[PDB]
Amino acid sequence: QVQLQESGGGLVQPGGSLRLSCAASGRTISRYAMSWFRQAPGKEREFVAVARRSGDGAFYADSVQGRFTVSRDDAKNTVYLQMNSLKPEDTAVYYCAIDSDTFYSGSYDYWGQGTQVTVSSEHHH
Amino acid sequence: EVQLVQSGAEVKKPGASVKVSCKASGYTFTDYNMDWVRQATGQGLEWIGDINPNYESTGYNQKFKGRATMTVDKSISTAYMELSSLRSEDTAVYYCAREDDHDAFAYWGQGTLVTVSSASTKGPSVFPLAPSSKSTSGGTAALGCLVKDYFPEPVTVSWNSGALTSGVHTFPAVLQSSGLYSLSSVVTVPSSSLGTQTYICNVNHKPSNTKVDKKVEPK
Amino acid sequence: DNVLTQSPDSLAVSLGERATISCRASKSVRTSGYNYMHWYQQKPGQPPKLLIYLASNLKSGVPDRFSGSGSGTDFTLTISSLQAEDAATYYCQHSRELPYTFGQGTKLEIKRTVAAPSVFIFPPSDEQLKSGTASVVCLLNNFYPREAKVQWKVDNALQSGNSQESVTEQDSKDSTYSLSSTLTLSKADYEKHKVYACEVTHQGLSSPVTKSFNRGEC
Amino acid sequence: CPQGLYPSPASVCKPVRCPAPVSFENGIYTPRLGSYPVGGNVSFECEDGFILRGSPVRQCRPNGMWDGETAVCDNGAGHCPNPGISLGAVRTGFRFGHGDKVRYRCSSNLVLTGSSERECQGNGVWSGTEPICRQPYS
Ligand SMILES: *[C@@H]1O[C@H](CO[C@@H]2O[C@@H](C)[C@@H](O)[C@@H](O)[C@@H]2O)[C@@H](O)[C@H](O)[C@H]1NC(C)=O
Ligand SMILES: [Ca+2]
Ligand SMILES: [Cl-]
Prior knowledge:
- The PDB classes it as immune system.
- The structure holds four protein chains of four kinds.
- By secondary structure, chain A is mostly beta strands.
- In chain A, 0% of the residues lie in helices and 48% in strands.
- Chain A has strands spanning 3-7, 10-12, 18-25, 34-39, 46-51, 58-60, 68-73, 78-83, 92-99, 108-111, 115-119.
- In chain A, the strands form two sheets. In chain A, strands 2, 4, 5, 6, 9, 10 and 11 form a seven-stranded mixed sheet that branches.
- Chain A is globular and about 45 Å long.
- Chain D is an all-beta fold.
- The interface between B and C is large, with 47 and 49 residues.
- The site of calcium ion (CA) has 3 residues of chain B, from loops.
- Calcium ion binds next to loops of chain B.
């Protein structure tokens, strides 16, 4: 029974940068890949990035390659998503999920409730 | 300019013996040992032993328990490896390999497949993997051939006598519990071609001297 | 015997970037001022090719983006700028004593973006069914990375022990993989059931996807 | 041919090579090659319980001969020392008590120089001299 909690959402302007964090409790996640997904309203949930075990690499979706970076702090039981060069189409609820399969087949059995990222000029002066 | 040329593939029952040859050219044969190395398919490399052609003296990996015997014929610049009391776990590609002055394997034969199994040589049955709405995505459709129940490896699969190459995926064979191999070859084509264009998979199994052409068409 | 352990067992590197592979020997391979460790490249269908001898010396004709370092029990092979022709399995080998032994191999592949599989399914042919056997084939096309799970269901009952799967090598054009899973049943079992399905899991999928057919058009 | 090469005819000039050990009892040698280049070295090591006598590292010289003294791993339980096996030679006899003999022969096409047979004398010494296998050339 793993519990995940995302944080770091907020309002950011186009071209801006933002860092999300996903903290795990109830299990050490160092053995497991951790993935980020996102869901915009009226669209299906989209893969963003995966941080495999330290030394096994990070992999990205085409839509975010070059702009987003996933990393992990195994001591803190936390994974991160650094986002740069943000676009309005990046507006979404961002979710983290743990891959229960240590052989990396993508058995995503536990998910966080998500954190909202809104890319907009409306609240920046 | 150095070349090591090995004898061809072998198929053996358990308990039998096999003798692989390795013809050397392009250097003075007695300047160097000849070594033998094997590799089980998908697995790592295992040194078997060596022979000094000057003396016909030998060294062996103890793990082979004296089952391996190496000899040479200096008059034809050929080394031989004989492995007796064969087991299924001796199924592998066998290489002759020649050291350089740093004791690294600078030169390698092409490899010799030795298959050890109670199975007997048998050509494949070839069945169509018909295109349908369940193999369609966008304007493209997948179709294929299932090449089932042959022994030993290998089989070669072509499409339209080699006239079709783009989009082909021929999968590695799997060994079934029967001791016979099976593989599939698939190809992605335009959905609009399926009414006008014929698709034929050409299967060649040289160990049984079998050739089978199967026309794959929609259901 | 000296045991050579390579790490990682596999790695994905982007074109142009540095790739580093390690080899740790259980016993030192250093004697007489030389490190008797050598590195090889192997591609499918070919014997290994010597790249580096005595830990750090490039064999003639090998590109100089390859280099080796280390001494004693610790060694590394480095490709300073990965090129498409460098995708291969790499092996270390010692020549300190007999038996000569090799590392287990490190598979170096080309990194690309994640791609979830396209999933297709094929019923058995009528010709095969006449012979008493039914093979049902599930095809996962053009996905990345390689790791995936296929599970078969027959009339919504999970299957086990009656399927085998096989994966291609990385595609030369788009650097993806494809996978086939084959479910084998008797004719009698195939004709007793209606719905044949393969469920597919992959790190690029938020939920498993299922592809299925209903025996006899529908 | 110049130094370090020998003619294929009596007169292409092929490189000289020093002979490898036919065997090396109760030890190993590194690198383990079929023959050795001029300037190359071979290093000898003994198993547990044995004494390494002779030269532990030997270099191949331009006339096809090794420098130093023949290496041997000798446990020491004999009236005479282990006489060893000169590189290129074969030795029959695995006893070194008083009166026991050993016979030598050069394998391949090497030329034997020295005593083909030796006897373990009473004072803990081998009779005659040590055979040395020369290349046919030079
Ligand atoms: C062979 O050895 C010659 C003598 O060098 C000594 O022995 C070697 C084994 C090392 O321990 C070295 O440090 C010693 O000084 C060398 O002059 C000669 O170059 C060596 N040949 C090689 C290494 O190919
Ligand atoms: Ca060698
Ligand atoms: Cl990593």
